[PDB]
Design a protein around this ligand. Structure first.
Ligand SMILES: N[C@@H](CCC(=O)N[C@@H](CS)C(=O)NCC(=O)O)C(=O)O
Ligand SMILES: N[C@@H](CCC(=O)N[C@@H](CS)C(=O)NCC(=O)O)C(=O)O
Lengths: 222, 216
């Protein structure tokens, strides 16, 4: 089990516009790792549960007649970094590692949970419309923290001049900001980093619109 | 050469800060305690759209070789402590166990605690008084139910095997918060058993809110 077996096969349980799954798709793409895409239709399950809980992301690792199910984006990405150290998405110096993990956690723990689908559904059940106002408030708060923290240490990307785990968390969170109609004018460093990332093939590959389960534009809910 | 010094910005009852106090205590690391008037800070944030920047607790200030580093986010700080000061280890040696322990930690870090952040609960309360209590209770119970299941599959004496890990550093403060909101903990017997094993250890006793300089 503890040998770095080379014939591990990877299967990602993903939903096209899950920001949490997207982070893992970015880790996989940036490390050049092939994987099988297992679609989990979270919209269908939401509508079904309302009329009458799949975990996303889950990275299934198969080996020697054994399956491991890895959960939590940050745990999954830390596993990818330990198992496949090149190209590194955490730097080798300890201060930089702490900085990158902090930028990731600002999103992971400080922003995304406040706008997850269960949270938003419970908000708009009690007070109609208020979920999108709430999402904009908490996303803006998270992005303001990131703009300040990123500007100190960013080169072309969130940390220096190559992609790191911090970018894996930033890019999907900016997409959600746009989804909820948040003005990104106040985050110039984040916008710059987003543009740099968007031009790279691995980011293009991981984007919601390129995923097997992506609906056409005219069949996407807000 | 200026050897490394540690200062923790903490509030006695902050679960986020407590996690870091546990990492420090478990590793036998001395640190300067710097108390933050969190209640005054939160009152100001509430009246001003939570604009006050770089003001989250915990912050671990580390000075070495004439340079100061301000480490934020409990999980990032704890991972730094594990890398900087490896013994005693708070992560297991094997890749699978490390991923399990990090997932357990993140269930609390990202999946339970943010739902009961004072700002979240304040915004709920401003809209619908009383909603904050219902919400905190719902989300903490939901988090602990999922955590009970996950911890049971792999716990020994502690959350992961027979030694404390980062998972226990997240579990123990979250259970204290559950009690604060009046939640029955009977439905989480594995979590309770682990909590009791941790409570008997000197480092857990030292990190507890009641032992902190700013405890009233
Ligand atoms: N912190 C998790 C977030 C994943 C996530 O948001 N998952 C959804 C379910 S698909 C969730 O937990 N929603 C809130 C809940 O169901 O309690 C990660 O990074 O993997
Ligand atoms: N995910 C963060 C959570 C930190 C947190 O929630 N801090 C709060 C409670 S101590 C805080 O500083 N509140 C005051 C403020 O936001 O100004 C961590 O793990 O460090």
């Amino acid at each position: 089990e503890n040998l770095y077996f080379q014939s591990m096969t990877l299967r990602l349980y993903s939903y096209w516009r899950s920001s949490s799954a997207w982070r893992v798709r970015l880790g996989l793409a940036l490390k050049g790792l092939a994987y099988e895409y297992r679609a989990v239709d979270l919209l269908a399950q939401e509508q079904f549960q309302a009329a009458h809980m799949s975990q996303v992301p889950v990275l299934e690792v198969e080996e020697d007649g054994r399956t491991h199910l890895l959960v939590q984006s940050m745990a999954i990405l830390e596993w990818l970094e330990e198992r496949h150290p090149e190209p590194a998405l955490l730097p080798p110096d300890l201060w930089g590692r702490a900085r990158v993990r902090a930028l990731a956690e600002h999103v992971n723990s400080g922003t995304q949970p406040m706008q997850n689908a269960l949270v938003l559904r419970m908000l708009r059940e009690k007070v109609p419309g208020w979920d999108r106002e709430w999402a904009r408030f908490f996303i803006a708060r998270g992005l303001a923290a990131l703009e300040t923290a990123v500007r100190d240490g960013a080169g072309r990307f969130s940390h220096g001049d190559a992609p790191t785990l911090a970018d894996c968390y930033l890019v999907p969170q900016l997409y959600n900001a746009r989804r909820f109609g948040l003005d990104l004018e106040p985050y110039p460093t984040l916008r710059r980093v987003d543009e740099a990332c968007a031009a790279l093939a691995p980011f293009q590959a991981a984007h919601p619109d390129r995923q097997p389960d992506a609906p056409p534009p005219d069949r996407r809910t807000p």
